[PDB]
């Protein structure tokens, strides 16, 4: 952390953060969500990290070069160490990226190596070549070299994500799935795991072997698993919580902005809220049905009437303010809602649905005040505007994500936040073979457009292709875009170091500090 001249620090440097839900895992290769990555940034550090404003910056690698954007060479700092005192080496990254690629690991982020185009990843994922053929090598203990199959000028931007953080081979091998228990885990971030009580708390303590430990100020941070945004706000105002999770409750937010304005942080956020349709299951495999649901949802009622927290009505998957997005707003988004209703009713009538044989399906959401209130409103809107019936179902976070991967669903509430600021961080998740494709959407036209983006060496051609990829997605109604999120949360006045400037919200507790209060 960089404490400004003249700030007086509190004697006690501890922090309590709400983290939305119980994490899926602490293993960097078994996680895919925001709650998981929030904890992962404090424990595992990859080649690069985001600085306090979000820019990709030196992590374990102090410096790097590229040759034609295809061969990337990372110079690892000599004093990078794990929490057991042993050196972090390039061999750790070799093992780790191979373990990520290996289909036996079944990482939800195996395709992150396809997004970066690391040599031989397609055959490794498909079981055609062993994971040891991946295009990564340690040239020595402090030099990691990555070979890609085509130029990727933004490749380094991907490297702050948890999936490309190192994992300790000796602990993994000796302890299997219990390697992340407090008695066994070994970490190389600013913190180490002290306690992990499922559905209660995760407590981290400063890691004295961290190479940048002298700049770490917070000695202990606790992450809570509270999925009720009302409860999070309540335990923040009670004094227990220093920073809420960034999902705000419909019940209290308006009150909160008038009662504690200076604690209500509202910043740009590269995330999109949408209803994910299971594209492989009838009758959601019919484009007319998917289009009807997309058009009959009234975004203005949701965004400005039921939620009203500063979100913007959405018409695409990739947020329009992503670096490199130059999207074309479709004609349906400019129409009146009445005009969207008739078209939707028209397509569902065309699809074979009637008053006596209506469309009825499940709407799955992860346990939450916010998601439940939005799903009830969406259910009412769809019933009123399109005559469709929905049965709401809540599931805890970890189970909810597995359901979506399994495809044991009809429609699910969903949110994707960028992992790097470039349109492919969204668009690659809709590729036919992506491990993050929970829409179960498979379009050869869409896949071709994205494949074409690294075959040109021109940013405008690339942007035009991302725009056309969004149009292909829209044309097929793969999803139901709802709104682009704002990053809204409460932060106590004594928490220093959180700018709100990073649109990816890649917070590191090593950058924060507690002001005397
Ligand atoms: U004190
Ligand atoms: U650039
Ligand atoms: U940029
Ligand atoms: U269903
Ligand atoms: U509630
Ligand atoms: U460029
Ligand atoms: U105090
Ligand atoms: U105190």
Could you list some keywords that capture this structure?
1 chain of a larger assembly, 517 residues, alpha+beta, D-Maltodextrin-Binding Protein, domain 2, 3 domains, 6-stranded mixed sheet, 4-stranded mixed sheet, 18 strands, binds uranium atom, peptide transmembrane transporter activity, peptide transport
What would you note in describing this structure?
This protein is of the alpha+beta class. The chain folds into three domains: 177 residues, D-Maltodextrin-Binding Protein, domain 2 (3-Layer(aba) Sandwich), CATH 3.40.190.10; 124 residues, Dipeptide-binding Protein, Domain 1 (Dipeptide-binding Protein, domain 1, Alpha-Beta Complex), CATH 3.90.76; 216 residues, Dipeptide-binding Protein, domain 3. Helix content is 30%, strand content 20%. The protein is built from 17 helices and 18 strands. The strands form five sheets. It has a six-stranded mixed β-sheet. The chain binds uranium atom (8 copies). One uranium atom binds next to loops. The site of one uranium atom has 2 residues, from loops.
